[PDB]
Amino acid sequence: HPLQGKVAFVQGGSRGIGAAIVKRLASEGAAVAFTYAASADRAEAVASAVTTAGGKVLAIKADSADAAALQQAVRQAVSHFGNLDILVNNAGVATLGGTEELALDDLDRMLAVNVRSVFVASQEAARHMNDGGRIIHIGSTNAERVPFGGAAVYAMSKSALVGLTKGMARDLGPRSITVNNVQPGPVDTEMNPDAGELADQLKQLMAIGRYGKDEEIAGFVAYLAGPQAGYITGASLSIDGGFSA
Amino acid sequence: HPLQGKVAFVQGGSRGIGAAIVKRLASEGAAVAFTYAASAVTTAGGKVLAIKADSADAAALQQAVRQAVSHFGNLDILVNNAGVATLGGTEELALDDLDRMLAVNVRSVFVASQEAARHMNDGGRIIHIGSTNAERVPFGGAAVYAMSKSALVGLTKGMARDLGPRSITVNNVQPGPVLMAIGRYGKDEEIAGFVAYLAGPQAGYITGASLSIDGGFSA
């Protein structure tokens, strides 16, 4: 139980990678508050995976596009569990579209969720975080390698976290809070399954030859959130099966 | 004991970070052979083997790997932790010091990696110990040292491609001191814990990466 007595906030905790993060932090002893945008049923199943196993949890409905909601969610978490130790920023939106074709609404929604809300959550959490804390953003390997058309805005939204992480590491380093940017490759989820021709084409670009697993992303996040990782800060850390080699 | 039954080779395992890596991998259950700088020492019924070998000597390194495999079978893990740091300006650095940094920091990393790869189980792990000076060189005097460490970035990428069909991962751990965002130097045990994580069964999807553990020196 390396996270015994710690409090974690996960932005986007109800499915895929986020659900795996919430469960793994809880299994290591953390109390976890998480946000979900869409489904109360799904957030219930996540909340039950934590509690049936003995862990403590709070599920908060919050739209990562609304400033006010994330700020509110952070405060509600703090009321419930006390000051934060760990923040994991896992909201994410993907729309494909060429430079000449992408709709401005889609651009706006990727900026709101993938960029703006990462900062806003980070700011509120930092205001309510213990010294010695951990802030982990979930970015993408597309910040480093964009091998196909249609991902310009997505990749922009993710390479944004590189500079955010560096400057936040400077800001919060005097409080011994680390800040890191986890950059996954393709991961097998319901909306991006390891199946079909698209998947095959992505696997071909990867050194390993399979999609990553939610639990593997979770493992790394939990290592970074833990007591051995206090010297890792400012870093963009790829976990992408060699996609970006 | 997530490394129970696994075998590790650590090039440069006798003090500081190397010693911490040896100790951590052994504590997780691995058999560990390491080099330090033919002569070897071990304990009856123990699973740690210390082998005297200069990292500039190609035959001694190849032999050391082969000795490890004789004791313990195919490797699962290699950690390349040898390293020399000589300061000198571009105009002044002695060519023998250039040669020593290339031999130890660069050439012996490939030599050990090649020999390990020939005797390594699929599903294995290769971890190079590089430096954050590959990304940020804030003062004069470190050009050859920085060069020797940024070399490991292209090596890591290309070896990851070579070995990925055998599910062997290859990564480059980049420490900073053991300019700082966090206000302290790193502890050898911290570097070791990151190596141990990458060496273990949860890290099979991490490959080709240069992973900084530097207190934000390079931010």
Numbering used by the authors:
A (entry chain A): 5 to 249
B (entry chain B): 5 to 41, 51 to 191, 209 to 249
Can you quote the paper on this entry?
Given an atomic resolution diffraction of apo-form (1.47 Å), the structure of the mutant F98AF202L was determined to 1.87 Å, showing a clear electron density map of F98A and F202L. A close-up view of the region between residues 98 and 202 showed that there is significant conformational alteration: (1) no contacts between residues 98 and 202 in F98AF202L [Cβ(Ala98)–Cδ1(Leu202): 9.81 Å; Cβ(Ala98)−Cδ2(Leu202): 11.39 Å] and in F98LF202L [Cδ1(Leu98)–Cδ2(Leu202): 9.20 Å and Cδ2(Leu98)–Cδ1(Leu202): 9.33 Å]; and (2) an additional H bond between the hydroxyl groups of Y98 and Y202 in F98YF202Y [hydroxyl O(Tyr98)–O(Tyr202): 3.10 Å]. Thus, the replacement of the bulky aromatic chain with a shorter side chain at the region of residue 98 greatly led to the loss of the hydrophobic contacts between two arms. Structural comparison of the mutant structures (F98AF202L, F98LF202L, and F98YF202Y) demonstrated an overall homologous fold. Structural comparison indicated relatively low RMSD values among these structures [apo vs. F98AF202L: 0.11 Å (223 Cα atoms); apo vs. F98YF202Y: 0.14 Å (234 Cα atoms); and apo vs. F98LF202L·NADPH: 0.14 Å (226 Cα atoms)].
We have previously identified an SDR from Serratia marcescens BCRC 10948 (SmSDR) that was able to convert 1-(3-hydroxyphenyl)-2-(methylamino) ethanone (HPMAE) into (R)-PE. SmSDR is a 3-oxoacyl-acyl-carrier-protein (OACP) reductase of the classical SDR subfamily that catalyzes the reduction of its authentic substrate, OACP, to (3 R)-3-hydroxy-ACP, participating in the fourth step of 16-carbon palmate biosynthesis. Each subunit is intertwined to form an α/β/α-fold barrel, of which the seven-β-stranded central sheet is flanked by six α-helices on either side, showing a nucleotide-binding Rossmann scaffold. Two phenylalanines, Phe98 from the β4–α4 loop (residues 94–107) and Phe202 from the α7 helix, face toward each other, thus constituting a bridge structure over the top of the binding pocket.
